[PDB]
Amino acid sequence: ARDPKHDILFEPIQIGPKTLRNRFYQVPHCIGAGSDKPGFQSAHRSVKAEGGWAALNTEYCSINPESDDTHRLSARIWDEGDVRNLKAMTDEVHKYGALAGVELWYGGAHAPNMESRATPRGPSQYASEFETLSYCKEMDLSDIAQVQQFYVDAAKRSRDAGFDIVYVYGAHSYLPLQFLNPYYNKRTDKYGGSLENRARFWLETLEKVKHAVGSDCAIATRFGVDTVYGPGQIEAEVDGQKFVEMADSLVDMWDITIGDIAEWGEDAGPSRFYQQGHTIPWVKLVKQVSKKPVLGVGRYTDPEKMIEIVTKGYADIIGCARPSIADPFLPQKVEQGRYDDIRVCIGCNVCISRWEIGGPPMICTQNATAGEEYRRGWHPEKFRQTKNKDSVLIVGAGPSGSEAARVLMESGYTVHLTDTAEKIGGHLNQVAALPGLGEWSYHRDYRETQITKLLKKNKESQLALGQKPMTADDVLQYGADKVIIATGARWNTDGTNCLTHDPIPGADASLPDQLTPEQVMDGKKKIGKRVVILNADTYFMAPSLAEKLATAGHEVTIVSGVHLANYMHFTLEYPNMMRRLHELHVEELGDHFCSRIEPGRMEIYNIW
Amino acid sequence: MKILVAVKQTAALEEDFEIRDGMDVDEDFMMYDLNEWDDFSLEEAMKIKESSDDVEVVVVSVGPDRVDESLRKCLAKGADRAVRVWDDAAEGSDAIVVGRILTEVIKKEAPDMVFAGVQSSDQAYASTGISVASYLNWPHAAVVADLQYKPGDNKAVIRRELEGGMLQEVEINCPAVLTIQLGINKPRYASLRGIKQAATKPIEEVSLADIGLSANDVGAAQSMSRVRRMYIP
Amino acid sequence: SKILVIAEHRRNDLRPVSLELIGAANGLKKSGEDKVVVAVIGSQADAFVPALSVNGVDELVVVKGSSIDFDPDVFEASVSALIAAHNPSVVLLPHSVDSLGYASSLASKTGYGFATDVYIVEYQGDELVATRGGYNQKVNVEVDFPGKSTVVLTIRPSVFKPLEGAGSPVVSNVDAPSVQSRSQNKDYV
């Protein structure tokens, strides 16, 4: 049964001329779709439609070739080809009876424009603190009118296109915010200086947009009320509130975030440094001045936490991004009170990793059909059930084999899942024990929960943990019709790496002063005052271990033969990871590989 | 030599069951499985059987056509035969009536050891084994967390797991009825090729008349309490 | 009439739940002439007199057997031996691992009313009503004891609130039936 305290969550709300069936709102977010993958775009939002989110939005959407995000992919609404391709999605969000927003974007010099080659315009001449090679032209007053018409244009075409919601996207430090914010805005004419100068651009733009489709589409804006940079950028209690105040009559809805573009990690909080609701303290402050509907993300997956922020009059609606990728059905699960069936977004940001690399499609660590709904036609909550009696052995019940069984059993098969470990999760179990990653558990947690549930529903099907490792004889004699081996990988023992592809002579971690991240992680094997992490890995392993050991008070040097933490640049984790390794006085020697290990001693070399 | 293990098929409700009459829960909310404790039983016995060179393990169950399901799972988990004692008039026998019905199977079977679980997962009576022990007139101990028994001893040595975790050793005259407690061993799991070969085994069906009972002996009419109400609290 | 309580001890110490049961028993007496008898069993069960000499106890019966601590054969015999000879309406025991070991046998032999892990009780008229859990404790399960002149109950510990203060029980002694336990305690661990 639906706990009735959550009823609150299924109460409509008025947003201008538009009505949200319920409180569950998918804010704009990229997916690797844009206008370019109209299949994938439609399907992936329409399942969330069918899943019962109220309104679904395209990712940030370009109003003109002089804001082109290539190599990244954004969406576009430049021409009638675009209005075609985006309509596919609106019809499709429509047939399930929620709303379609589209997020009107121009980002000035943050748009490198590598496809369109055109020149980007801004309040003042600068060069992006993100695409550092990409400079804007200073708009004169005629540049102010032509770009504003841009949005108008783009707002018209948004209605032809069938959007129920349009935004003036003013977050992550794109055009309207660049005007507002003195960091960017060095103008001394009437568009600059005074708070009502700064916000004229946006204030204007909003109005123009209203005038344009105001009576058929709710105009929302997203706004980045604090930059979390402090003095010198927007502060919520300085410019933030006030701006809310100056806009409020224009907006049908606020859609709130904090951060800039260069480290939007602060909007999209890593679970490695942020919990749920993180944003709230700065979210809150917006209701205290707005008289309009306000939503504001914050990795809200828990309906308890959801009801808190509404019944405490901190939001009106629930803004989600990631959590809607994890579980397109999270609402109808909450509506249906099916609390245990909910797939909890772990905050791993791999999903932002792909888009942030420039080109590939989003993928997701809980939701393996994410990206897969058009092109493979996998639905996250419907499965082809088998038309035989066939059975499957699965060896190992880690991410891989556990999904293996989850899906199969959901498919109706007869499955025996076995692993030598005592619990479901393969190496996730240590991974989640690394400092910060405690919310990455969730990924076995959900599996353990559903296999358990699946077993009562298949009677032959079987879970067996604590077993004797299987042998190939056990396996051939097991009697499964089919077998999935899912037995894992281990850290390399022997200094084998991506540079040499051969072992480092004198590397071997049966020796007393030599560790793997299993041995560090098991916590048994004993660890010397002075530590050196020899790193060939661009992802989290290295830094993290570094954190661990430092916090346990060893003296720490990472020897890195690759760019450390490179992946992390892309999950939005990197800033706070570095600051963190600084804070714990962790020594980094880059561009440095190693040619032989000896007791107490290693030979290292610059790679240039 | 022969160890007889008394097993039960329990019920587990779904969310959100509903009461039925007000005397039970509705039957559609129910799901039947081998009581959890019995998995620890069956093993201890397979433990013994494999510790030697010749021991029949035999599981016995009282109840309806469903139970089969469980006794087969016992076959696969190790048992040598599986017996089901039934008659419709057995409806609602309570934990002491079960003792008695078991006992009469237990005599025909004449084992050297009788194992019961410590309590059921469903009604948690924590009576059925000791009841079989009174009626049999055997030496009993309840709550067994360790067994040393070799086949055809006159004598075994157990350990009761007391409240809070402190153990107590007991020396007990055999043949004895013992209720086995959780954590006693690590009950095996059935290969598919195992579960497959236990399909092909017979469940022996035993009738009240086969065991010198009658309708007038069993079912709630004879029981030791009587159901007044069941209510979700 | 009378309610019987069987107290429980281990390594020289009286267990809390013994006062709870005395509390329960008194709690459930149907009029203030009805007497509570308490019984402690052990080859040194008299050491206990002081602490069971408290409020609600109208009698304290000390039964010396073979064993120092809990033995089932001895207990079983000891209790039916107390019941036979005080004729009570109810007997309380703790639901304790000690009790699993013989509560049930007692009931098997006699047909008294029996129910365990009881955590509600209650007279309704002269009808005794005890409540149990069903389905791994998902419902509550009310039962009664038709025409039973003796009912045996095991009571869920840390439910029934004790009585405060001292008390003046008639103490008596009686020997446990000289019968050889078919078991033997050796050591704790």
Ligand SMILES: *c1c(C)c(C)cc2c1nc1c(=O)[nH]c(=O)nc-1n2C[C@H](O)[C@H](O)[C@H](O)COP(=O)(O)O
């Ligand atoms: C892309 C990617 C995949 C992520 C996950 C977020 C995102 C992406 N693209 C966005 C864009 O087109 N415009 C925009 O305004 N926001 C975009 N987002 C961020 C998202 O909307 C959320 O602000 C954050 O993810 C934080 O909230 P939450 O997911 O914790 O609920």
Ligand SMILES: Nc1ncnc2c1ncn2[C@@H]1O[C@H](COP(=O)(O)O)[C@@H](O)[C@H]1O
């Ligand atoms: N009807 C039955 N048939 C066989 N064994 C039973 C039956 N009912 C209870 N048991 C046994 O009693 C053990 C303890 O359960 P209980 O006293 O019901 O809590 C269960 O494992 C079985 O060993």
Ligand code: SF4
């Ligand atoms: S990749 Fe991770 S953080 Fe992203 S939606 Fe998925 S589970 Fe959530």
